[PDB]
Ligand SMILES: Cn1ccc(NCc2ccccc2)n1
């Protein structure tokens with residue numbers, strides 16, 4: 001679990017979105033596994049605006065942060081999970097690293113701020129859902 005809190009927005013994995021998130025829907029994209037919901041308390045988080053391919057993610061299954069090299073956001077085939085059938089996830093970045101389903105919501109961050117959130121895994125790669133392209137989160 002976990003989310004990004006920036007201005008009056010809450011960013012979560014779409015598949016982990018609560019009733020409250022959907023009642024306060026701002027934007028969702030199923031192919032990205034993201035949902036943004038409106039918040040009544042302001043958010044302090046800084047979103048990275050950059051094309052960094054290095055940083056650090058939180059791994060709740062290890063209670064520890066890991067430094068990684070990651071791919072640029074892309075269209076990667078992702079196997080069926082429970083929450084989705086097999087489909088092309090968009091804006092996905094991969095790193096060689098440990099993750100399990102409950103690690104979703106873990107933040108990936110670089111020196112510029114939040115890059116994205118853990119979204120999928122398998123075969124020893126962690127996938128993160130990129131948020132740096134959503135310039136509207138910083139208004
Ligand atoms: C973020 N994330 C989703 C799946 C995953 N790792 C693959 C996996 C699936 C089920 C049990 C154990 C490991 N990491």
Ligand SMILES: [Zn+2]
Nearest residue numbers: 050052110112
């Ligand atoms: Zn950066």
